[PDB]
Design a protein around this ligand. Structure first.
Ligand SMILES: [Cu+2]
Ligand SMILES: [Cu+2]
Ligand code: NA
Ligand code: NA
Lengths: 620, 620
């Protein structure tokens, strides 16, 4: 019955059928994006209307369409032709990934470049890389991918060990033409292999790890109903999945006594970008919007038990559309489990004689995706004490280049002749807040140092200040770790027993934001990534910090355009957009396969509850 | 055989006997501190000399002594009378904790203050609190504790719920005299109880938590030999214990192929301080040096299985001296176990067809201590990939006050009439570095932004810079989160296969440092806490950032005095001292018992290895 249930195979085939019936999905049409829309505000009173949004590409060169379908009613709600030169190209299609290498393999310029390097064309892999927006006028309105080459010595070889530097090509994937081949000169192709399953490189595998067994003899403490509604240790939520964003959490709420108290209406990673910091023309255009351009949900891994996810795991297997509108299941694509999280609370009191210890646990909801060389784990955590956390785990194989003779200020050395260009991985979490309901506001809280003098004669006092962000023009904020800056989302109309507005405090990691010059293309296309915190007034069409169409799309849409409306956010339905990222100067230890590194944020209750919410946790 | 083995009961009784035989431990003497000394540099060639350092208090008012004993040889090496007014008072004695309440209970001023508040003296608990150094000339050279009162309604009541504000007393614990009783006026004593085991407050305990079972059917993957030598997944170390510092790690090294490579020679928390930010004269003197004044090791909890430590646990039971020199075991005072730590590395490669996943684990070495209302867990972690981490977990009951009518800039409200003064918990980790041996140096690494222009035409480039800290005068450093500042400890004479100096990078959390005015007593006594990173040249007598005697000791010793020597630290035997802390504005959720909050740091290999050190980790 829930309007927040996962899309079923049946719903996707029905969208296909409705589109077909309406003349919108003939043999030249391809689905570049398909997802269910969230219910409108206040729609719980009315009956279900499951609506799906679809981006339809045309392989014959016709203009694409954005379409909204009511699968409940079997109707097309709206269909509009897109002018991609204006509003952006559609996301990269799975089927286009092979096309760059295939077209290049019979191009005389490409073949000349490979021959100059004595490389067998049959062994040259070409990465299908998003193009962005630079100085090439002919690309405007065209679907372009750029190709960088990597040699694969044999079918099971890791091509990433053998980058072909000094060479890049641009391809029109619709007209199937190579537009440019740029050869700045030969670099040595690094020769050492990077095969992390080859016994010659690993050596004898360790025999020293004894098993760790994690079981739940009575099963898990969470329940799953209606396919994707979770109840666990007072928490209530619905686990959604979208082909762009991946796992999306809806209706995060906490049962405090008899009352189900909303906290977050929708939580997602609404964008992620990987900007590269190498000024070589071979890579200086490189910025991968994994979410917006590639769609991270689409590439979610099937997660194997006792391997990717350990313990008593409950899986969801979300369904997505293929390019023709047929349903495709991602088997075991979402892991759900609870785990022990050490000590929750502890005190041994001298005066009372009472010794007290309680254990913590967390509910974990995760998926893992692969985008070329990169693999990312997205983890959401709910804790007994009311804390909500997100963590991204970055691994995979580092994107490589040649390491220049005489070194580099923008590339590190991994192996003889092998370089790794500096880059960032920067995420945007979109938190549609609902602290005790939708009437919310945000304050920036700084620590306040005090001067020794009257009222503070010993020079020990310190304090804090809170500044309400009243309108969108004032709600673009930066970190200040030195002053312990955080942001509190409160409900000014809902007070705790001490007559204080209930709230949650966002604790950021205060990692560097986007490093690129403010006049660059990437600073404009990923403007969200230049500041740590944005607050907007909720609107149903303000979904992504980069807008709906990121691929080959200049600035003009996304967060900078949203906040220009300068709307009231002081006790209104608001959305927090938190930028957080990793700045990566690759180390030798990252090669030939990278150990996980992490980044994230959390929110902790701040006068939300009337006392600790975990007094009723039992011993042992 | 190891000179780094834990002290045995026999060694402590032997120190007692040697001191007795030498005339240094008659019936009026009390041991305030006793611990084993680390071996001297280059002492591995010579036979064992187990030496113990002892601080001896005299209850008859005679001057205390600092004594070094060779337990191996049965001799007193050195004994020196201390002038405490100059060099500091000895640590607070366990036996002094009851004395403040006992003396106050028959003092007419104290009794008058309690009678003004209608409080039964038999119900008034008095916390024995360190005094620090303020404006009271008569305290110089005297052992003083200050007392703050809390009412206990019945034997099992949590007194912390019932602070008696407006009242403080000062007591000479040797002469057994009350020096001052200060009553600034009556405040209401908060009436609600804070009894977190009372069913009336907890409500019915949850029945929803299903068991989680963590077992190791073949046992743990680590070995323990010689009592305290750990070998685990290429790591090698010795787990020490000291009554002041608690768990101390020695000889942290990693077996890389055939070579045992040192990383850290000694790691400890060498100080921790809890400064309060309430300018009321009742608490404005409050700064608890839990390590330096109270000795955190002394109060280590006995940790219960399946409760404090979960899984297949190996315990150490360290032995300490009581006040008379008799050995006392802290049963199960140190937990050691390994645990699963999610995904280590993962890649699913399109071109090779190879899908690869490996799991991480960490070795955990921990203890938990209780200092009055506070309880702290100290956790050291070693990871498969070479990462070393420390985490402090803070819990217990918040230190309380009245909440003033009309509010406070320096105190938060927890319950009706109940306040919690703002404070910090600030730790100093002393890391005696040995990156591939003792010849080490530290660089500060900042991210470097670059301007769009020639050489960077697209405005995408970014870089980094490293600054070697060459001498101690240049090695007092602050955080800069915005520029991604870290510190790399390298060995300039030990190069990896890429001809780069091997190293480890310290990643701080960049939390605020000491907030107090720079002219305060606490800014001088805890000078270390004002800056994030200090580097010194190693010396055997530079043990604590606050010096040997912290109790009632002004500035003059510790880190500021050490670095004045301006010694060479560029390719020398050096020590890194990292300040990190929590700034606590207590929330209603912290009452009546605080959920754990955490702070820490980690160090990751940075070109230490020639490639990933976890290629030989097996599947599943
Ligand atoms: Cu990276
Ligand atoms: Cu605290
Ligand atoms: Na909202
Ligand atoms: Na050293």
């Amino acid at each position: 019955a829930s309007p927040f249930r996962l899309a079923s195979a049946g719903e996707i085939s029905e969208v296909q059928g409705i589109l077909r019936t309406a003349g919108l999905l003939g043999p030249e049409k391809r689905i570049a994006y398909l997802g269910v829309l969230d219910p409108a505000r206040g729609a719980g009173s009315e009956a279900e209307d499951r609506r799906f949004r679809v981006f339809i590409h045309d392989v014959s060169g016709a203009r694409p369409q954005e379409v909204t379908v009511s699968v409940t009613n079997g109707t097309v709600i709206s269909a509009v032709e897109l002018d991609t030169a204006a509003t952006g190209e559609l996301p990269v299609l799975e089927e286009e990934f092979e096309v760059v290498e295939q077209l290049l393999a019979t191009d005389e310029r490409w073949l000349k470049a490979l021959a100059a390097r004595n490389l067998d064309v049959s062994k040259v892999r070409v990465a299908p890389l998003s193009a962005g927006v630079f100085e090439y006028a002919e690309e405007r309105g065209r679907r372009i991918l750029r190709g960088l080459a990597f040699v694969q010595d044999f079918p099971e070889d890791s091509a990433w060990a053998h980058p072909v530097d000094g060479l890049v090509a641009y391809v029109d994937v619709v007209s199937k033409e190579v537009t440019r081949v740029i050869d700045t000169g030969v670099f040595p192709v690094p020769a050492e292999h990077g095969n992390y399953t080859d016994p010659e490189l690993t050596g004898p595998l360790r025999t020293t790890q004894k098993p760790i067994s994690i079981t739940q003899p009575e099963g898990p403490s969470f329940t799953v109903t209606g396919g994707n509604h979770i109840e666990w240790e007072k928490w209530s939520l619905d686990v959604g999945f979208d082909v762009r964003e991946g796992v999306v959490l809806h209706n995060i709420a906490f049962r405090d006594g008899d009352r189900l108290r909303p906290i977050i209406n929708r939580a997602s990673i609404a964008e992620m970008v990987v900007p590269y910091g190498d000024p070589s023309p071979i890579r200086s255009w490189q910025n991968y919007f994994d979410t917006g351009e590639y769609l991270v949900g689409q590439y979610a891994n099937s997660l194997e038990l006792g391997c990717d996810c350990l313990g008593d795991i409950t899986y969801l297997s979300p369904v997505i559309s293929d390019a023709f509108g047929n349903p495709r299941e991602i088997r075991n694509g979402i892991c759900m489990h609870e785990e022990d999280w050490g000590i929750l609370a502890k005190h041994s009191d001298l005066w009372s004689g009472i010794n007290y210890t309680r254990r913590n646990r967390r509910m974990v909801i995760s998926f893992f995706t692969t985008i070329g060389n990169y693999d990312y784990g997205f983890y959401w955590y709910l804790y007994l004490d009311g804390t909500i956390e997100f963590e991204a785990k970055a691994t995979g194989v580092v994107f490589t280049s040649a390491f220049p003779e005489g070194g580099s200020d923008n590339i590190s050395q991994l192996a003889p002749g092998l370089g790794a260009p500096f880059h960032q991985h920067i995420f945007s979490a979109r938190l549609d807040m609902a602290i005790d309901g939708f009437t919310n506001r945000v304050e920036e809280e700084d620590v306040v140092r005090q001067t020794m003098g009257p009222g503070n004669e010993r020079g020990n006092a310190f304090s804090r200040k809170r500044t309400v962000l009243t309108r969108e023009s004032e709600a673009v904020r930066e970190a200040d770790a030195r002053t312990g800056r955080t942001w509190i989302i409160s409900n000014p109309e809902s007070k705790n027993r001490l007559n204080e507005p209930v709230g949650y405090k966002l604790h950021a990691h205060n990692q560097p934001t986007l490093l690129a010059d403010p006049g660059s293309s990437i600073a404009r296309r990923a403007a969200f990534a230049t500041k740590d915190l944005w607050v907007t007034r909720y609107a149903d069409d303000e979904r992504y910090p980069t807008g709906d169409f990121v691929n080959q799309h200049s600035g003009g849409a996304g967060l900078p355009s949203y906040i220009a409306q300068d709307r009231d956010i002081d006790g209104q339905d608001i959305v927090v957009w938190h930028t957080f990222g990793l700045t990566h100067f690759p180390r030798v230890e990252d090669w030939p396969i990278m150990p996980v590194d992490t980044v994230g944020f959390k929110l902790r209750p701040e006068g939300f509850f009337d006392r600790s919410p975990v007094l009723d946790v039992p011993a042992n």
